């Protein structure tokens, strides 16, 4: 997952988490505007190993952390499917749940037989039980750090998003929290690209000087 | 190259696909190297790559680096411009003092004659007649110093008796600026010829790297003196711009009307060929 | 609304040339000015006069004639660059 | 930036016609589409590509050739309307 | 200054608070301006700033640029306050023929002695004894041509009687490759000394522009022919890979075991200082 | 208007443009959390000149400038209602609009009667004409400097919002652009408060030290 | 790009080049059979960061290096497009080629006008010139190392292949050649997985003991 | 068959003039040198054969005019 712009000499590769610091406010604002307008502008080009350019629908752009909606129909559906798989991996728990919903089905069936009208039904499944429970992620009481962590957790659930990009999101988190975010990103394998005006101390990042020189920086 | 590119703005320069790449935050522009003759950096905020410097050395393009005051600081000199340089060094060591003093005397005669032509175009009969008398009185070894007297009477007649070459005024500053630019172009031409620039054709005691290029650039000084005389009332910035207009303007060579760079290149070629052939023909440049 | 209008048609036949002269005279009578050959423009007061002018232009278009119409702002009209068919000193920086 | 381009030139001489064909082929190779004769347009990505295109068009302009360049918005470029064609005596028949 | 700063890696250079900032991907180093003496750029990926170039003009430090081949191409020439190397070139123009013949004869004697010693290490006593006899028979002006006679014996001993330098083969191309690398190193050292490489120690042939460095690198030539003899069966690519390890390998100088760069540097410095001082001591290198 | 939290000794007043710098990352992130949770959490308070607490509906919190849509259902509703009020203030113009709408309805009604299929219609209204025309604020923004200006225009247009708050939005704009934004805020009289992790040089701002003490700057 | 089988405790990630050494011949042959039959068998599961299982059409399996055909219609077509892009990046060369093609078209057009029949044509393009030249990769005289290198070069040209896998291909290459293959794979960013019965000395690899224990090995 | 006889006819007409065919061979040699240089610049090995006049005619698409307004034409 390499990104390239006219200011760079060679296309830079983005693997796992990547912290890109732009020391020039003009090039930073122009790059962010090229991130929002990316479908319209040909200056910023992001391509994969196949050299194929990714569509703006495949690109995931995030600026406001707490304003973004983490709960979507696809995210909640795939999450319910993941929970159903977790319950399916354990035979004993699945057997017990089958017994409980089974007994409930017996009761409701008796109540239906007591009625004068002829009533038919099918089944009460686990996905219907989860949908009836209303399982969803809670962003209401979550701190910004837990919000970005939940975004990194649900990025695997998003199928269409090729790369996640954060705009000036590293100013809220402490150095240790940034270390946790990067260390978790290395395990999640997702491609995250952070854009900050000022460099963060203690983490590996790519620095773009006002001279338009891109250099790797350990601190 | 036909084109003099001057960069006074902060930006980054790269070399891509035989093309000079000017990259800035506001805009980016690509200029081919074959069209570019001279590259001038007028500010200290410009960035460049050593690969572009190597491509400029292979393209034989003069690179000039100025100071924060915009005055030229240091220019790039390639070690080997052509393979004929190593063979020309033996000829330069084999040169004779009679050929050096003869060619230098003829060049000084061309410079004084050009000054008399400038004063004649300026309609000064006594001054151009006196400078012409010094031209007819020029001799080998220069015992009478008629060249320095011609310069003193030239500047003292043009700018007034109270004027002097040792003054710090913007007139002498623009004169040294034009002499530095023409000295840079002539020095680059001498680098193209391959002969040693530090060896002069007049005084073997004076040791300077610009001596030879100055001796070759002596006849062209009045061209700078004209624009300096016309723009002397204007500010030093406008005088510098008018000095930059000399590269765009064309001058009439004895053969035909040519650009300044072509006249300097062909003139230096005829001078080197005349030095190696021991004065076969002396190129003469007139205003 | 600045109305830019391009006009063309095969001119070979005499009837086609006469129709071209008639259409050009009609464009001049309607307030359009010819910047160059086939290039014209007119300043329409509002969208109403623009629509009526579009209908009139469709009615007055000669046989085989072709008209291109574009809506342009004053800032875009002042930016119009007409080139009718090599610099020694190139300056990148302040132009002095 | 939507670039509207008009192109005209005297076509009488054979060299002029050859130059017109060469310039038209150059316009087609650069991405310009001909809506009608002398009428062309091309979508430029930004202002830099527009300036470079202006310089290239000035360099490729044939002798006596005349080019009119106008900037129009993409939405205004879609607003382009192409019309392709009061008499007392109407004659349907031989025109006498 | 004293320390000679050379940049062989990709990096950027800046100037802040009278401090040169060198930035590489691994680490950042800041060097005081007064400590630096000569600055050389080995590769084409180095990035520099014109402000640092102006500070170097005020500091008089010599700036050397190199191409992808590592051969020095251009150097920075200031208009005023020139470096002392330009004053040192005049002594190179003043080099006497007796000193040049003495240093050349000593170099040929060192190369032939290294060839005979290498043949002794290869356990050929007749060929090494013959080359040693030619070494003891070498004389000034080279009437015997014992070097060209020792050549055929050395190559015929190494690669066989059928092998020759004129034939086109991966062995000859490998020898020209190793001689190209050694010519790049010795040429870079001569450029560091400031002496013009066009002036050679051999008075017969001025054709090559590298003649000085090509004459200085002769005593180290057999070290390449050893690896070329061991790897002769391998393809030219593998021979290039083996010859690329000579920079990492350490060799025994007369004083102490050192890297090839420092050995060539000390040898070149002793050669230049001996030529300017007219033969105080001749650096001797033995395998 | 004034804002008050447990960290400050006394509530600080926010008038026209205001720049607030928080030198503690924990207090900054917790402060933004208190901004988004302001309805849920009672820690952060805002007291106007009337010394009355304001609901979160009256507080306008904008973090991403480019990601904030200028066109919304409520904004278009208030704009269409405003244009309808302006057209209702002039009886003659609205009468002419009713006449033209009557003519168009007569033409379309005649064409409907010409058809063989029965057609039923109701009427055409000025609101349906505005919504049919698609009246909306200009969506063209070249840079974030212009987008923030449009946000200030729509904020000054909205009467219900008593305060506009930007979180780390000053890092995109240059110092000169910050001066133009402050001058435009002083000319528009609107109340704008900025939250930055680090201090900005050259402009007047309130610096909150890690010691929790608040000090004025420039 | 993580691969997982029943023998592994956790799914192992494959990034750039990866050397997997199976010390047990039974598990190695069974794993290779599961690689050829992968669509039929559910034991071996390869999934990306999205956890989506890749189809066998997306998987590229290679055993015989010299027997594989590197020249295909899609590979040659995309290669010709790449050459056309390389010629398009240089304005001067494209201008010269356009001039020559213009001359040839003038000659052929004159010959067409000389004929009695009315003849029409269109153009001679650069892609048609390359197709007429017959540009293709030469595997005839290529050594096995150059063949695998050309396969790593054309893997970027293949759009549908998600991951390239080699079966016992490291036995022919010398240690230095393996170092060149890995170092080139790090630059190409492609995902390559090698399967060898015996461990290779000097390169980082994952070793599977006869005890079925997977351990990282530096040498 | 019609395009085969037409292309063969044009090839015969070009073969009747040695100088014109020589110039065509020179231009084809230049284009082959340029494309060959671009192929050598690429990192992947490339093998080519040659370019022929028949492949140039077929690449140009020489054919009889397909424009017919009416059945009379
Ligand atoms: Ca159900
Ligand atoms: Ca519920
Ligand atoms: Ca062929
Ligand atoms: Ca074709």
Author numbering:
A (entry chain D), G (entry chain H): 1 to 219
B (entry chain P), E (entry chain O): 3 to 289
C (entry chain Q), D (entry chain T): 6 to 90, 100 to 110
F (entry chain C): 1 to 218
H (entry chain E): 74 to 146
Please quote the authors directly.
CRISPR-Cas is a set of microbial adaptive immune systems characterized by the insertion of short viral- or plasmid-derived DNA fragments called spacers into the CRISPR regions in the microbe’s chromosome. However, the type II-A CRISPR-Cas systems of Streptococcus thermophilus and Streptococcus pyogenes encode four Cas proteins: Cas9; Cas1; Cas2; and Csn2, all of which are essential for adaptation in vivo (Heler et al., 2015, Wei et al., 2015). We show that the Cas9, Cas1, Cas2, and Csn2 proteins of a Streptococcus thermophilus type II-A CRISPR-Cas system form a complex and provide cryoelectron microscopy (cryo-EM) structures of three different assemblies. The structures we present here shed light on the initial stages of spacer capture and reveal an unprecedented higher order assembly of Cas1-Cas2-Csn2 proteins that appears to play a role in this process.
In addition to the monomer complexes, a fraction of the Cas1-Cas2-Csn2 particles formed larger complexes: one formed discrete particles that were larger than the monomer complexes and the other was filamentous. A structure for the larger discrete particles was obtained at 7.2-Å resolution. These particles contain two sets of the Cas18-Cas24-Csn28 minimal complex bridged by a pair of Cas14-Cas22 subcomplexes, with the protein components again related by D2 symmetry. One form contains two of the monomer particles with an additional interface comprising a further four Cas1 dimers and two Cas2 dimers. This “dimer” complex (Cas124-Cas212-Csn216) contains two fragments of duplex DNA running through the center, and the additional pair of Cas2 dimers caps the ends of this DNA. In the dimeric state, the additional Cas1 dimers dock at a site at the hinge between the Csn2 head and tail domains that is very different to the sites bound by the Cas1 subunits in the monomer. The same region of both Cas1 N-terminal domains (NTDs) in the dimer is located at the binding site but with a different site on Csn2. The alternate binding mode in the dimeric form does not induce any significant conformational changes within the monomer complexes, which, at this resolution, are unchanged relative to the free monomer. Duplex DNA is bound along a central channel but with two sections of DNA, each of ∼30 bp, bound within the two monomers. The larger Cas1-Cas2-Csn2 “dimer” assembly shows that additional Cas1-Cas2 subcomplexes can dock between a pair of the Cas18-Cas24-Csn28 complexes and are able to access the ends of the centrally bound DNA via the Cas2 dimers. Despite the medium resolution of the dimeric Cas1-Cas2-Csn2 structure, it is clear that the conformation of the middle Cas2 dimers in our structure is more similar to that in SpCas2 (Ka et al., 2018) but differs to that in other Cas2 structures and in the Cas1-Cas2 integration complexes.
